[PDB]
PDB file of all heavy atoms in Angstrom:
ATOM      1  N   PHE A  67      30.353 -18.706   0.882  1.00 52.24           N
ATOM      2  CA  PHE A  67      30.884 -18.432  -0.448  1.00 52.24           C
ATOM      3  C   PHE A  67      32.388 -18.668  -0.476  1.00 52.24           C
ATOM      4  O   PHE A  67      33.111 -18.168   0.392  1.00 52.24           O
ATOM      5  CB  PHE A  67      30.609 -16.983  -0.856  1.00 52.24           C
ATOM      6  CG  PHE A  67      29.156 -16.615  -0.885  1.00 52.24           C
ATOM      7  CD1 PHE A  67      28.717 -15.459  -0.264  1.00 52.24           C
ATOM      8  CD2 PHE A  67      28.231 -17.414  -1.532  1.00 52.24           C
ATOM      9  CE1 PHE A  67      27.386 -15.107  -0.286  1.00 52.24           C
ATOM     10  CE2 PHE A  67      26.896 -17.065  -1.557  1.00 52.24           C
ATOM     11  CZ  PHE A  67      26.474 -15.910  -0.933  1.00 52.24           C
ATOM     12  N   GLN A  68      32.858 -19.419  -1.472  1.00 54.17           N
ATOM     13  CA  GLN A  68      34.278 -19.714  -1.599  1.00 54.17           C
ATOM     14  C   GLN A  68      34.683 -19.749  -3.065  1.00 54.17           C
ATOM     15  O   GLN A  68      33.911 -20.192  -3.920  1.00 54.17           O
ATOM     16  CB  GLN A  68      34.638 -21.056  -0.944  1.00 54.17           C
ATOM     17  CG  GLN A  68      33.713 -21.472   0.183  1.00 54.17           C
ATOM     18  CD  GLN A  68      34.200 -22.708   0.906  1.00 54.17           C
ATOM     19  OE1 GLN A  68      35.362 -23.095   0.783  1.00 54.17           O
ATOM     20  NE2 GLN A  68      33.313 -23.335   1.670  1.00 54.17           N
ATOM     21  N   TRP A  69      35.894 -19.274  -3.348  1.00 54.22           N
ATOM     22  CA  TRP A  69      36.447 -19.360  -4.692  1.00 54.22           C
ATOM     23  C   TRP A  69      37.029 -20.753  -4.902  1.00 54.22           C
ATOM     24  O   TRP A  69      37.610 -21.339  -3.984  1.00 54.22           O
ATOM     25  CB  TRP A  69      37.538 -18.318  -4.932  1.00 54.22           C
ATOM     26  CG  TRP A  69      37.080 -16.896  -4.997  1.00 54.22           C
ATOM     27  CD1 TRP A  69      37.448 -15.878  -4.167  1.00 54.22           C
ATOM     28  CD2 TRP A  69      36.175 -16.330  -5.951  1.00 54.22           C
ATOM     29  NE1 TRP A  69      36.831 -14.710  -4.548  1.00 54.22           N
ATOM     30  CE2 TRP A  69      36.042 -14.962  -5.639  1.00 54.22           C
ATOM     31  CE3 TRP A  69      35.463 -16.846  -7.036  1.00 54.22           C
ATOM     32  CZ2 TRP A  69      35.226 -14.106  -6.372  1.00 54.22           C
ATOM     33  CZ3 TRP A  69      34.653 -15.994  -7.762  1.00 54.22           C
ATOM     34  CH2 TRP A  69      34.542 -14.640  -7.428  1.00 54.22           C
ATOM     35  N   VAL A  70      36.879 -21.282  -6.116  1.00 53.43           N
ATOM     36  CA  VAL A  70      37.395 -22.620  -6.375  1.00 53.43           C
ATOM     37  C   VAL A  70      38.918 -22.604  -6.388  1.00 53.43           C
ATOM     38  O   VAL A  70      39.558 -23.579  -5.976  1.00 53.43           O
ATOM     39  CB  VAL A  70      36.830 -23.179  -7.694  1.00 53.43           C
ATOM     40  CG1 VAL A  70      35.322 -23.350  -7.589  1.00 53.43           C
ATOM     41  CG2 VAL A  70      37.201 -22.281  -8.864  1.00 53.43           C
ATOM     42  N   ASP A  71      39.526 -21.513  -6.855  1.00 56.62           N
ATOM     43  CA  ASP A  71      40.979 -21.435  -6.882  1.00 56.62           C
ATOM     44  C   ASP A  71      41.574 -21.170  -5.506  1.00 56.62           C
ATOM     45  O   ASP A  71      42.802 -21.182  -5.368  1.00 56.62           O
ATOM     46  CB  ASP A  71      41.438 -20.337  -7.845  1.00 56.62           C
ATOM     47  CG  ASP A  71      40.941 -18.965  -7.447  1.00 56.62           C
ATOM     48  OD1 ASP A  71      40.102 -18.878  -6.529  1.00 56.62           O
ATOM     49  OD2 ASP A  71      41.399 -17.971  -8.044  1.00 56.62           O
ATOM     50  N   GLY A  72      40.744 -20.926  -4.496  1.00 54.73           N
ATOM     51  CA  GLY A  72      41.226 -20.723  -3.148  1.00 54.73           C
ATOM     52  C   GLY A  72      41.563 -19.295  -2.792  1.00 54.73           C
ATOM     53  O   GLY A  72      42.157 -19.063  -1.732  1.00 54.73           O
ATOM     54  N   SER A  73      41.206 -18.331  -3.633  1.00 55.32           N
ATOM     55  CA  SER A  73      41.511 -16.940  -3.346  1.00 55.32           C
ATOM     56  C   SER A  73      40.543 -16.382  -2.308  1.00 55.32           C
ATOM     57  O   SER A  73      39.461 -16.926  -2.069  1.00 55.32           O
ATOM     58  CB  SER A  73      41.446 -16.110  -4.626  1.00 55.32           C
ATOM     59  OG  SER A  73      42.348 -16.609  -5.598  1.00 55.32           O
ATOM     60  N   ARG A  74      40.949 -15.283  -1.679  1.00 51.41           N
ATOM     61  CA  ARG A  74      40.109 -14.669  -0.666  1.00 51.41           C
ATOM     62  C   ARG A  74      38.874 -14.036  -1.296  1.00 51.41           C
ATOM     63  O   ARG A  74      38.899 -13.563  -2.435  1.00 51.41           O
ATOM     64  CB  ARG A  74      40.868 -13.602   0.123  1.00 51.41           C
ATOM     65  CG  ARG A  74      40.045 -13.086   1.301  1.00 51.41           C
ATOM     66  CD  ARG A  74      40.744 -12.041   2.145  1.00 51.41           C
ATOM     67  NE  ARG A  74      39.935 -11.724   3.317  1.00 51.41           N
ATOM     68  CZ  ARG A  74      38.929 -10.860   3.326  1.00 51.41           C
ATOM     69  NH1 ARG A  74      38.588 -10.182   2.243  1.00 51.41           N
ATOM     70  NH2 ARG A  74      38.240 -10.677   4.449  1.00 51.41           N
ATOM     71  N   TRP A  75      37.778 -14.049  -0.539  1.00 48.36           N
ATOM     72  CA  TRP A  75      36.514 -13.463  -0.979  1.00 48.36           C
ATOM     73  C   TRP A  75      36.454 -12.029  -0.464  1.00 48.36           C
ATOM     74  O   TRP A  75      35.872 -11.730   0.581  1.00 48.36           O
ATOM     75  CB  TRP A  75      35.349 -14.303  -0.478  1.00 48.36           C
ATOM     76  CG  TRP A  75      34.021 -13.927  -1.036  1.00 48.36           C
ATOM     77  CD1 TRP A  75      33.168 -12.984  -0.547  1.00 48.36           C
ATOM     78  CD2 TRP A  75      33.387 -14.479  -2.195  1.00 48.36           C
ATOM     79  NE1 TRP A  75      32.037 -12.921  -1.321  1.00 48.36           N
ATOM     80  CE2 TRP A  75      32.148 -13.827  -2.342  1.00 48.36           C
ATOM     81  CE3 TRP A  75      33.747 -15.462  -3.121  1.00 48.36           C
ATOM     82  CZ2 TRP A  75      31.267 -14.125  -3.377  1.00 48.36           C
ATOM     83  CZ3 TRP A  75      32.870 -15.758  -4.147  1.00 48.36           C
ATOM     84  CH2 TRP A  75      31.645 -15.091  -4.267  1.00 48.36           C
ATOM     85  N   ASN A  76      37.069 -11.124  -1.227  1.00 47.93           N
ATOM     86  CA  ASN A  76      37.200  -9.730  -0.827  1.00 47.93           C
ATOM     87  C   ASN A  76      36.340  -8.789  -1.663  1.00 47.93           C
ATOM     88  O   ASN A  76      36.446  -7.568  -1.509  1.00 47.93           O
ATOM     89  CB  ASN A  76      38.671  -9.300  -0.898  1.00 47.93           C
ATOM     90  CG  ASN A  76      39.239  -9.357  -2.311  1.00 47.93           C
ATOM     91  OD1 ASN A  76      38.570  -8.999  -3.280  1.00 47.93           O
ATOM     92  ND2 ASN A  76      40.486  -9.800  -2.428  1.00 47.93           N
ATOM     93  N   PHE A  77      35.495  -9.322  -2.543  1.00 47.54           N
ATOM     94  CA  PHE A  77      34.664  -8.484  -3.394  1.00 47.54           C
ATOM     95  C   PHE A  77      33.511  -9.320  -3.931  1.00 47.54           C
ATOM     96  O   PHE A  77      33.600 -10.547  -4.021  1.00 47.54           O
ATOM     97  CB  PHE A  77      35.461  -7.862  -4.546  1.00 47.54           C
ATOM     98  CG  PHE A  77      34.602  -7.161  -5.556  1.00 47.54           C
ATOM     99  CD1 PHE A  77      34.075  -5.910  -5.285  1.00 47.54           C
ATOM    100  CD2 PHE A  77      34.295  -7.762  -6.762  1.00 47.54           C
ATOM    101  CE1 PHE A  77      33.273  -5.265  -6.205  1.00 47.54           C
ATOM    102  CE2 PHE A  77      33.493  -7.122  -7.686  1.00 47.54           C
ATOM    103  CZ  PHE A  77      32.981  -5.874  -7.407  1.00 47.54           C
ATOM    104  N   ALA A  78      32.421  -8.639  -4.275  1.00 49.23           N
ATOM    105  CA  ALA A  78      31.257  -9.286  -4.865  1.00 49.23           C
ATOM    106  C   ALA A  78      30.368  -8.211  -5.470  1.00 49.23           C
ATOM    107  O   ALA A  78      30.231  -7.125  -4.901  1.00 49.23           O
ATOM    108  CB  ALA A  78      30.482 -10.110  -3.828  1.00 49.23           C
ATOM    109  N   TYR A  79      29.769  -8.520  -6.622  1.00 44.85           N
ATOM    110  CA  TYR A  79      28.870  -7.602  -7.321  1.00 44.85           C
ATOM    111  C   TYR A  79      27.538  -8.316  -7.575  1.00 44.85           C
ATOM    112  O   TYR A  79      27.194  -8.653  -8.708  1.00 44.85           O
ATOM    113  CB  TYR A  79      29.515  -7.113  -8.623  1.00 44.85           C
ATOM    114  CG  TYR A  79      28.786  -5.991  -9.336  1.00 44.85           C
ATOM    115  CD1 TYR A  79      27.641  -5.415  -8.802  1.00 44.85           C
ATOM    116  CD2 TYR A  79      29.254  -5.509 -10.551  1.00 44.85           C
ATOM    117  CE1 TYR A  79      26.984  -4.392  -9.461  1.00 44.85           C
ATOM    118  CE2 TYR A  79      28.604  -4.489 -11.215  1.00 44.85           C
ATOM    119  CZ  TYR A  79      27.470  -3.935 -10.668  1.00 44.85           C
ATOM    120  OH  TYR A  79      26.824  -2.917 -11.331  1.00 44.85           O
ATOM    121  N   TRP A  80      26.786  -8.535  -6.500  1.00 42.28           N
ATOM    122  CA  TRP A  80      25.538  -9.280  -6.580  1.00 42.28           C
ATOM    123  C   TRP A  80      24.439  -8.432  -7.214  1.00 42.28           C
ATOM    124  O   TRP A  80      24.384  -7.212  -7.040  1.00 42.28           O
ATOM    125  CB  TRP A  80      25.108  -9.744  -5.190  1.00 42.28           C
ATOM    126  CG  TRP A  80      26.082 -10.676  -4.547  1.00 42.28           C
ATOM    127  CD1 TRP A  80      26.930 -10.395  -3.517  1.00 42.28           C
ATOM    128  CD2 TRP A  80      26.298 -12.049  -4.882  1.00 42.28           C
ATOM    129  NE1 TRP A  80      27.667 -11.507  -3.194  1.00 42.28           N
ATOM    130  CE2 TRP A  80      27.298 -12.537  -4.018  1.00 42.28           C
ATOM    131  CE3 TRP A  80      25.747 -12.914  -5.831  1.00 42.28           C
ATOM    132  CZ2 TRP A  80      27.758 -13.852  -4.076  1.00 42.28           C
ATOM    133  CZ3 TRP A  80      26.203 -14.218  -5.885  1.00 42.28           C
ATOM    134  CH2 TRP A  80      27.199 -14.674  -5.014  1.00 42.28           C
ATOM    135  N   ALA A  81      23.558  -9.096  -7.957  1.00 45.04           N
ATOM    136  CA  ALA A  81      22.484  -8.415  -8.657  1.00 45.04           C
ATOM    137  C   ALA A  81      21.367  -8.018  -7.695  1.00 45.04           C
ATOM    138  O   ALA A  81      21.310  -8.456  -6.543  1.00 45.04           O
ATOM    139  CB  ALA A  81      21.915  -9.304  -9.761  1.00 45.04           C
ATOM    140  N   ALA A  82      20.468  -7.171  -8.190  1.00 47.89           N
ATOM    141  CA  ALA A  82      19.242  -6.874  -7.464  1.00 47.89           C
ATOM    142  C   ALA A  82      18.407  -8.141  -7.340  1.00 47.89           C
ATOM    143  O   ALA A  82      18.172  -8.843  -8.328  1.00 47.89           O
ATOM    144  CB  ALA A  82      18.452  -5.780  -8.179  1.00 47.89           C
ATOM    145  N   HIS A  83      17.964  -8.434  -6.117  1.00 48.76           N
ATOM    146  CA  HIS A  83      17.205  -9.644  -5.810  1.00 48.76           C
ATOM    147  C   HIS A  83      18.100 -10.880  -5.821  1.00 48.76           C
ATOM    148  O   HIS A  83      17.642 -11.989  -6.102  1.00 48.76           O
ATOM    149  CB  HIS A  83      16.029  -9.832  -6.775  1.00 48.76           C
ATOM    150  CG  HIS A  83      15.267  -8.572  -7.048  1.00 48.76           C
ATOM    151  ND1 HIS A  83      15.429  -7.842  -8.205  1.00 48.76           N
ATOM    152  CD2 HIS A  83      14.340  -7.913  -6.314  1.00 48.76           C
ATOM    153  CE1 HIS A  83      14.637  -6.785  -8.172  1.00 48.76           C
ATOM    154  NE2 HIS A  83      13.964  -6.805  -7.035  1.00 48.76           N
ATOM    155  N   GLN A  84      19.374 -10.685  -5.519  1.00 46.49           N
ATOM    156  CA  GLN A  84      20.358 -11.738  -5.333  1.00 46.49           C
ATOM    157  C   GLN A  84      21.049 -11.489  -4.004  1.00 46.49           C
ATOM    158  O   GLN A  84      20.987 -10.379  -3.467  1.00 46.49           O
ATOM    159  CB  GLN A  84      21.396 -11.760  -6.464  1.00 46.49           C
ATOM    160  CG  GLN A  84      20.857 -12.188  -7.821  1.00 46.49           C
ATOM    161  CD  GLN A  84      20.689 -13.692  -7.940  1.00 46.49           C
ATOM    162  OE1 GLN A  84      21.129 -14.449  -7.076  1.00 46.49           O
ATOM    163  NE2 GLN A  84      20.063 -14.132  -9.025  1.00 46.49           N
ATOM    164  N   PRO A  85      21.707 -12.501  -3.434  1.00 49.32           N
ATOM    165  CA  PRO A  85      21.737 -13.899  -3.868  1.00 49.32           C
ATOM    166  C   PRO A  85      20.831 -14.788  -3.027  1.00 49.32           C
ATOM    167  O   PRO A  85      20.413 -15.855  -3.466  1.00 49.32           O
ATOM    168  CB  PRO A  85      23.215 -14.260  -3.681  1.00 49.32           C
ATOM    169  CG  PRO A  85      23.594 -13.505  -2.425  1.00 49.32           C
ATOM    170  CD  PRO A  85      22.784 -12.217  -2.465  1.00 49.32           C
ATOM    171  N   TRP A  86      20.490 -14.357  -1.818  1.00 49.31           N
ATOM    172  CA  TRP A  86      19.850 -15.252  -0.871  1.00 49.31           C
ATOM    173  C   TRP A  86      18.432 -15.600  -1.315  1.00 49.31           C
ATOM    174  O   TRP A  86      17.821 -14.921  -2.145  1.00 49.31           O
ATOM    175  CB  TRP A  86      19.822 -14.617   0.518  1.00 49.31           C
ATOM    176  CG  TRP A  86      21.154 -14.098   0.950  1.00 49.31           C
ATOM    177  CD1 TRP A  86      21.514 -12.792   1.104  1.00 49.31           C
ATOM    178  CD2 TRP A  86      22.318 -14.874   1.249  1.00 49.31           C
ATOM    179  NE1 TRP A  86      22.826 -12.707   1.501  1.00 49.31           N
ATOM    180  CE2 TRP A  86      23.343 -13.973   1.594  1.00 49.31           C
ATOM    181  CE3 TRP A  86      22.590 -16.245   1.265  1.00 49.31           C
ATOM    182  CZ2 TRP A  86      24.620 -14.397   1.952  1.00 49.31           C
ATOM    183  CZ3 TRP A  86      23.857 -16.665   1.622  1.00 49.31           C
ATOM    184  CH2 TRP A  86      24.856 -15.744   1.961  1.00 49.31           C
ATOM    185  N   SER A  87      17.912 -16.686  -0.740  1.00 48.49           N
ATOM    186  CA  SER A  87      16.539 -17.133  -0.970  1.00 48.49           C
ATOM    187  C   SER A  87      16.278 -17.516  -2.426  1.00 48.49           C
ATOM    188  O   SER A  87      15.151 -17.401  -2.914  1.00 48.49           O
ATOM    189  CB  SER A  87      15.537 -16.067  -0.515  1.00 48.49           C
ATOM    190  OG  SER A  87      15.432 -15.022  -1.466  1.00 48.49           O
ATOM    191  N   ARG A  88      17.302 -17.977  -3.135  1.00 50.90           N
ATOM    192  CA  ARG A  88      17.130 -18.409  -4.517  1.00 50.90           C
ATOM    193  C   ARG A  88      18.429 -19.053  -4.976  1.00 50.90           C
ATOM    194  O   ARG A  88      19.461 -18.963  -4.306  1.00 50.90           O
ATOM    195  CB  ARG A  88      16.758 -17.243  -5.442  1.00 50.90           C
ATOM    196  CG  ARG A  88      17.897 -16.257  -5.686  1.00 50.90           C
ATOM    197  CD  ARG A  88      17.461 -15.033  -6.491  1.00 50.90           C
ATOM    198  NE  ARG A  88      16.913 -15.377  -7.799  1.00 50.90           N
ATOM    199  CZ  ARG A  88      16.628 -14.495  -8.749  1.00 50.90           C
ATOM    200  NH1 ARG A  88      16.829 -13.198  -8.574  1.00 50.90           N
ATOM    201  NH2 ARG A  88      16.126 -14.925  -9.904  1.00 50.90           N
ATOM    202  N   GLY A  89      18.364 -19.704  -6.136  1.00 53.15           N
ATOM    203  CA  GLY A  89      19.552 -20.225  -6.776  1.00 53.15           C
ATOM    204  C   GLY A  89      20.005 -21.565  -6.229  1.00 53.15           C
ATOM    205  O   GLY A  89      19.450 -22.126  -5.283  1.00 53.15           O
ATOM    206  N   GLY A  90      21.045 -22.084  -6.866  1.00 53.47           N
ATOM    207  CA  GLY A  90      21.682 -23.346  -6.535  1.00 53.47           C
ATOM    208  C   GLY A  90      22.964 -23.138  -5.759  1.00 53.47           C
ATOM    209  O   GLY A  90      23.075 -22.219  -4.939  1.00 53.47           O
ATOM    210  N   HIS A  91      23.949 -23.996  -6.022  1.00 52.13           N
ATOM    211  CA  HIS A  91      25.208 -23.989  -5.289  1.00 52.13           C
ATOM    212  C   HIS A  91      26.374 -23.538  -6.164  1.00 52.13           C
ATOM    213  O   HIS A  91      27.512 -23.962  -5.955  1.00 52.13           O
ATOM    214  CB  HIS A  91      25.509 -25.378  -4.719  1.00 52.13           C
ATOM    215  CG  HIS A  91      24.568 -25.814  -3.641  1.00 52.13           C
ATOM    216  ND1 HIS A  91      23.330 -26.358  -3.907  1.00 52.13           N
ATOM    217  CD2 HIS A  91      24.698 -25.814  -2.294  1.00 52.13           C
ATOM    218  CE1 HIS A  91      22.729 -26.655  -2.768  1.00 52.13           C
ATOM    219  NE2 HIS A  91      23.538 -26.336  -1.774  1.00 52.13           N
ATOM    220  N   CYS A  92      26.109 -22.678  -7.146  1.00 49.38           N
ATOM    221  CA  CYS A  92      27.165 -22.159  -8.005  1.00 49.38           C
ATOM    222  C   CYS A  92      26.819 -20.753  -8.473  1.00 49.38           C
ATOM    223  O   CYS A  92      25.680 -20.483  -8.862  1.00 49.38           O
ATOM    224  CB  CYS A  92      27.397 -23.073  -9.215  1.00 49.38           C
ATOM    225  SG  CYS A  92      28.215 -24.646  -8.835  1.00 49.38           S
ATOM    226  N   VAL A  93      27.808 -19.861  -8.423  1.00 47.75           N
ATOM    227  CA  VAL A  93      27.621 -18.449  -8.740  1.00 47.75           C
ATOM    228  C   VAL A  93      27.776 -18.258 -10.243  1.00 47.75           C
ATOM    229  O   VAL A  93      28.622 -18.896 -10.881  1.00 47.75           O
ATOM    230  CB  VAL A  93      28.625 -17.574  -7.966  1.00 47.75           C
ATOM    231  CG1 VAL A  93      28.358 -16.101  -8.228  1.00 47.75           C
ATOM    232  CG2 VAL A  93      28.553 -17.872  -6.479  1.00 47.75           C
ATOM    233  N   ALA A  94      26.961 -17.370 -10.812  1.00 46.94           N
ATOM    234  CA  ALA A  94      26.977 -17.085 -12.240  1.00 46.94           C
ATOM    235  C   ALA A  94      26.964 -15.583 -12.475  1.00 46.94           C
ATOM    236  O   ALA A  94      26.207 -14.853 -11.829  1.00 46.94           O
ATOM    237  CB  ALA A  94      25.775 -17.724 -12.944  1.00 46.94           C
ATOM    238  N   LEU A  95      27.799 -15.129 -13.406  1.00 46.66           N
ATOM    239  CA  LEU A  95      27.873 -13.716 -13.759  1.00 46.66           C
ATOM    240  C   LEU A  95      26.886 -13.423 -14.882  1.00 46.66           C
ATOM    241  O   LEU A  95      26.956 -14.031 -15.956  1.00 46.66           O
ATOM    242  CB  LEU A  95      29.294 -13.339 -14.175  1.00 46.66           C
ATOM    243  CG  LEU A  95      29.536 -11.898 -14.630  1.00 46.66           C
ATOM    244  CD1 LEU A  95      30.968 -11.486 -14.311  1.00 46.66           C
ATOM    245  CD2 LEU A  95      29.261 -11.715 -16.116  1.00 46.66           C
ATOM    246  N   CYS A  96      25.972 -12.493 -14.630  1.00 47.44           N
ATOM    247  CA  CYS A  96      24.985 -12.099 -15.626  1.00 47.44           C
ATOM    248  C   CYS A  96      25.658 -11.306 -16.740  1.00 47.44           C
ATOM    249  O   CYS A  96      26.326 -10.300 -16.481  1.00 47.44           O
ATOM    250  CB  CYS A  96      23.879 -11.274 -14.972  1.00 47.44           C
ATOM    251  SG  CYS A  96      22.289 -11.343 -15.828  1.00 47.44           S
ATOM    252  N   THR A  97      25.482 -11.757 -17.983  1.00 44.05           N
ATOM    253  CA  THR A  97      26.154 -11.108 -19.104  1.00 44.05           C
ATOM    254  C   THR A  97      25.695  -9.670 -19.298  1.00 44.05           C
ATOM    255  O   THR A  97      26.371  -8.902 -19.991  1.00 44.05           O
ATOM    256  CB  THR A  97      25.918 -11.895 -20.394  1.00 44.05           C
ATOM    257  OG1 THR A  97      24.510 -12.034 -20.626  1.00 44.05           O
ATOM    258  CG2 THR A  97      26.554 -13.270 -20.304  1.00 44.05           C
ATOM    259  N   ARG A  98      24.568  -9.289 -18.703  1.00 43.13           N
ATOM    260  CA  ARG A  98      24.059  -7.924 -18.767  1.00 43.13           C
ATOM    261  C   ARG A  98      24.521  -7.182 -17.519  1.00 43.13           C
ATOM    262  O   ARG A  98      24.125  -7.530 -16.402  1.00 43.13           O
ATOM    263  CB  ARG A  98      22.534  -7.924 -18.855  1.00 43.13           C
ATOM    264  CG  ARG A  98      21.895  -6.563 -18.624  1.00 43.13           C
ATOM    265  CD  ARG A  98      20.379  -6.661 -18.639  1.00 43.13           C
ATOM    266  NE  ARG A  98      19.912  -7.653 -17.676  1.00 43.13           N
ATOM    267  CZ  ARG A  98      19.910  -7.482 -16.360  1.00 43.13           C
ATOM    268  NH1 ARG A  98      20.385  -6.378 -15.805  1.00 43.13           N
ATOM    269  NH2 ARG A  98      19.441  -8.452 -15.580  1.00 43.13           N
ATOM    270  N   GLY A  99      25.366  -6.170 -17.704  1.00 45.86           N
ATOM    271  CA  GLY A  99      25.833  -5.357 -16.605  1.00 45.86           C
ATOM    272  C   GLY A  99      26.949  -5.949 -15.774  1.00 45.86           C
ATOM    273  O   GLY A  99      27.697  -5.190 -15.143  1.00 45.86           O
ATOM    274  N   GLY A 100      27.093  -7.271 -15.745  1.00 49.13           N
ATOM    275  CA  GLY A 100      28.132  -7.892 -14.953  1.00 49.13           C
ATOM    276  C   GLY A 100      27.742  -8.276 -13.545  1.00 49.13           C
ATOM    277  O   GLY A 100      28.633  -8.541 -12.728  1.00 49.13           O
ATOM    278  N   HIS A 101      26.451  -8.310 -13.227  1.00 49.98           N
ATOM    279  CA  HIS A 101      26.014  -8.651 -11.880  1.00 49.98           C
ATOM    280  C   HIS A 101      26.058 -10.160 -11.672  1.00 49.98           C
ATOM    281  O   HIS A 101      25.659 -10.935 -12.546  1.00 49.98           O
ATOM    282  CB  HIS A 101      24.592  -8.144 -11.624  1.00 49.98           C
ATOM    283  CG  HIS A 101      24.443  -6.658 -11.729  1.00 49.98           C
ATOM    284  ND1 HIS A 101      24.304  -6.005 -12.935  1.00 49.98           N
ATOM    285  CD2 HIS A 101      24.384  -5.700 -10.774  1.00 49.98           C
ATOM    286  CE1 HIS A 101      24.184  -4.707 -12.719  1.00 49.98           C
ATOM    287  NE2 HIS A 101      24.229  -4.495 -11.416  1.00 49.98           N
ATOM    288  N   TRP A 102      26.542 -10.572 -10.504  1.00 47.58           N
ATOM    289  CA  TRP A 102      26.611 -11.984 -10.163  1.00 47.58           C
ATOM    290  C   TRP A 102      25.235 -12.496  -9.754  1.00 47.58           C
ATOM    291  O   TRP A 102      24.431 -11.775  -9.157  1.00 47.58           O
ATOM    292  CB  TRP A 102      27.610 -12.232  -9.030  1.00 47.58           C
ATOM    293  CG  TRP A 102      28.996 -11.715  -9.299  1.00 47.58           C
ATOM    294  CD1 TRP A 102      29.414 -11.009 -10.388  1.00 47.58           C
ATOM    295  CD2 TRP A 102      30.147 -11.872  -8.460  1.00 47.58           C
ATOM    296  NE1 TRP A 102      30.747 -10.709 -10.277  1.00 47.58           N
ATOM    297  CE2 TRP A 102      31.221 -11.230  -9.102  1.00 47.58           C
ATOM    298  CE3 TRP A 102      30.372 -12.491  -7.229  1.00 47.58           C
ATOM    299  CZ2 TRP A 102      32.498 -11.187  -8.556  1.00 47.58           C
ATOM    300  CZ3 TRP A 102      31.644 -12.448  -6.689  1.00 47.58           C
ATOM    301  CH2 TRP A 102      32.690 -11.801  -7.352  1.00 47.58           C
ATOM    302  N   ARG A 103      24.970 -13.757 -10.086  1.00 48.41           N
ATOM    303  CA  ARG A 103      23.671 -14.365  -9.833  1.00 48.41           C
ATOM    304  C   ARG A 103      23.875 -15.839  -9.524  1.00 48.41           C
ATOM    305  O   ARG A 103      24.634 -16.519 -10.220  1.00 48.41           O
ATOM    306  CB  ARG A 103      22.741 -14.213 -11.040  1.00 48.41           C
ATOM    307  CG  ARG A 103      22.475 -12.782 -11.457  1.00 48.41           C
ATOM    308  CD  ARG A 103      21.489 -12.748 -12.611  1.00 48.41           C
ATOM    309  NE  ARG A 103      20.123 -12.969 -12.150  1.00 48.41           N
ATOM    310  CZ  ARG A 103      19.492 -14.136 -12.187  1.00 48.41           C
ATOM    311  NH1 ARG A 103      20.076 -15.227 -12.659  1.00 48.41           N
ATOM    312  NH2 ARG A 103      18.244 -14.212 -11.735  1.00 48.41           N
ATOM    313  N   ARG A 104      23.199 -16.327  -8.488  1.00 48.09           N
ATOM    314  CA  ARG A 104      23.269 -17.743  -8.162  1.00 48.09           C
ATOM    315  C   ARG A 104      22.564 -18.570  -9.229  1.00 48.09           C
ATOM    316  O   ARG A 104      21.585 -18.136  -9.842  1.00 48.09           O
ATOM    317  CB  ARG A 104      22.650 -18.009  -6.792  1.00 48.09           C
ATOM    318  CG  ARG A 104      23.568 -17.656  -5.637  1.00 48.09           C
ATOM    319  CD  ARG A 104      22.849 -17.741  -4.302  1.00 48.09           C
ATOM    320  NE  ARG A 104      22.531 -19.109  -3.909  1.00 48.09           N
ATOM    321  CZ  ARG A 104      21.877 -19.430  -2.801  1.00 48.09           C
ATOM    322  NH1 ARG A 104      21.437 -18.504  -1.965  1.00 48.09           N
ATOM    323  NH2 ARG A 104      21.658 -20.713  -2.525  1.00 48.09           N
TER     324      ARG A 104
END
């Protein structure tokens, strides 16, 4: 996992049943609750 702007990866709010074993190559923030989703 890397930020495009080059900032350090010091936090993450992954959703239930995220992130591994699913998704593509870009992270997406779920508009419900704010959980990140691949």
Side-chain angles (χ1 to χ4, degrees):
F67 301 131
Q68 333 187 16
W69 291 119
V70 296
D71 61 351
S73 302
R74 187 179 186 277
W75 189 273
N76 63 40
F77 171 77
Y79 189 3
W80 298 107
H83 317 102
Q84 291 281 351
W86 310 111
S87 78
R88 71 186 301 189
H91 293 82
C92 288
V93 184
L95 178 151
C96 206
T97 56
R98 167 184 55 73
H101 299 81
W102 305 4
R103 301 183 77 262
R104 281 172 70 182

